[PDB]
Amino acid sequence: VSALERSLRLTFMDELMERARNRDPSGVSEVIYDMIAAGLSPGPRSFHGLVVAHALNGDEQGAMHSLRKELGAGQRPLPETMIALVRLSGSKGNAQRGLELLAAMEKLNYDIRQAWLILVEELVRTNHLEEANKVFLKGARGGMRATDQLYDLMIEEDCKAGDHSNALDISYEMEAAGRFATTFHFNCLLSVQATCGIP
């Protein structure tokens, strides 16, 4: 890399990252074609700015299309780039797409534990508790150990919704991982058991 190439990349990436943060996917596309005109090859961090710009404007189809451009260009997406797509999929309740992207991260040899945690909290936050349980159990049964805060979140939200079957499944997996249930978790299950008519 020469000094001239480094100087141009800095000013090209200054403009690109200032439009991704501006929530302007169209402008981030113009700079990439400016890079192509100058002969610079867009790397993983240039397509990250394109994914993020679409993702920030709640655009799942454009962000997925941007990822296809990155893979089609032969570039390797950054672990943060996949996390932006996974978190976006959860915000729209698209658990199938979120699980497809997690499979890609494993294929790319990344560490999917952090991205799996993010996917579950997004589904819970956006009132997709049924989808969140399906994703959480697949990760928990697959061997991943969730965070203590997410364990307390899943048990409590299921018991507030009258879903004892999911809350008992998770608490069994929580102890198998190595986190023993406390009075708080038992009080969540009891809140539903006390209304079943069988003391």
Partner: protein
Amino acid sequence: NACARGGLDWEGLLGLFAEMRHEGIQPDIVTYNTLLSACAIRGLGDEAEMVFRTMNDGGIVPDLTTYSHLVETFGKLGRLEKVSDLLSEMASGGSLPDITSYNVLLEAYAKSGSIKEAMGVFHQMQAAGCSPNANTYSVLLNLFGQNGRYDDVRQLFLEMKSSNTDPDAATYNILIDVFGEGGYFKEVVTLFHDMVEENIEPDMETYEGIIFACGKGGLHEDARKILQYMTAKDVVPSSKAYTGVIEAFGQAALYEEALVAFNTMHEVGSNPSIETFHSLLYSFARGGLFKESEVILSRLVNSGIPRNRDTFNATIEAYKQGGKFEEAVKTYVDMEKSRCDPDERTLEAVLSVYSCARLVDECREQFEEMKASDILPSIMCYCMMLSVYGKTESWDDVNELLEEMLSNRVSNIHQVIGQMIKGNYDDDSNWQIVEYVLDKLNSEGCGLGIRFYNALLDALWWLGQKERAARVLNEATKRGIFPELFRKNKLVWSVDVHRMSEGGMYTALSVWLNDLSDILVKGQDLPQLAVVVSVRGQLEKSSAARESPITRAAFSFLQDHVSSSFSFTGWNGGRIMCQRSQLKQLNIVALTNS
């Protein structure tokens, strides 16, 4: 039906029916359906008239088969106008005919090509007081569309829209097809935009029709919105629908987005067809990406697809634009070994090879054989002859060929274009005729337009009409030709000449250089870079791109026009750049007609 199939005479069936009526059992339309059927078989016009007249006196409502048999028996004798009289007679008899009868009568008239008769039938429908249905309108639009009356279909489409009759989807497919075949691609998208507001759900036929219009006309933005609309409605686009999107991107030299759509086809299971492997080959051929063309060729052999003639044409065109002259003629040499049948474009494909590498005697042998079979070679081959004669300064042959185009009593396009080359049509009022031809040619899409303008600018530049070539290029850009030619933002000032001929490239650089000095005179800021994109593909990441004929031609052209201000790039073989600091130390090119 035993006797009718058995071959009994016509009077036997009529006489057999007379026995039905005398038996006291109430007859049925079925026998009169038969009574009109064998008349249609034997072409009896008067006999069918008395048969129909008997039922009108019989007080029974006719069905669709009565009218169909009447239409068939009269059109066989070419007396369909009598059917209207048969309808008019029953109009005064208190039995109002159904629209199904009138629609069938229009359909036969549409088959016979009768426009005035269809107009009279439509008026007779209106006076009957019955509201025409959607199938009626679809018949006239297809009938009027087949005869090239596009203004008439526009009026009739507006009429039914204002007749409180919400058009059906199949109406739009007819409208889409007639406007798409006529080159009204912006109208096709406008039709969809109207059609989505009227709360009408499109179908697979609608999506493929619009995308084909976008692909032919090179409207990639509209094509992308169609695909997103289909995905947003959980619709999996067909393999043909994607091929139209792939076509549109190649028209705009957006290879990255074209190969994404190609990649997405296998993702959705819409595997590419043979036509898809042609959209890529023609897209790559224009840019001279023979590395990507060989990938398709190496993929076609193992995919079970034999090499047709269209594949061979793209291979020659790709090698020619890529500067591989030796490999271009070898493909034409190897083409004849494998039999096949070279078409007119193949002769034009190999002619451009010899014209590009200044082969005057070889071009002569290629040209007169074009007319040796009475083919009347198109304007593109004529413009290539002016290049090879103008490159060698053979002013005798240039004037000889121009006089051939000046008369050209058969083809109007040659006469106007040949006249405008000499400068006869360079007046304000006399440039409208030239523009009239350009608009007529701006209907086969961007694919034919790029070939026409590349040859025309090559001829003008080598003939010394360099100021005329500047205005011809300015006419192409406003029509959408060469959409990638120029970029002017704060970062990059670029000119992309990888899809142009040598004469077109020189014209593009000349205009671009003159416009570059304009912003230097004033305080219009400055781009971080001024670049010339001569190679646009996988060849960039290699030393061969800097040895491409286009890259050498642009650099040689730039060397003796702005001194040593544009230098190569150390990171890309197909770029010729100028830093912002060097832009400060910079008409630059003289544009005159010989």
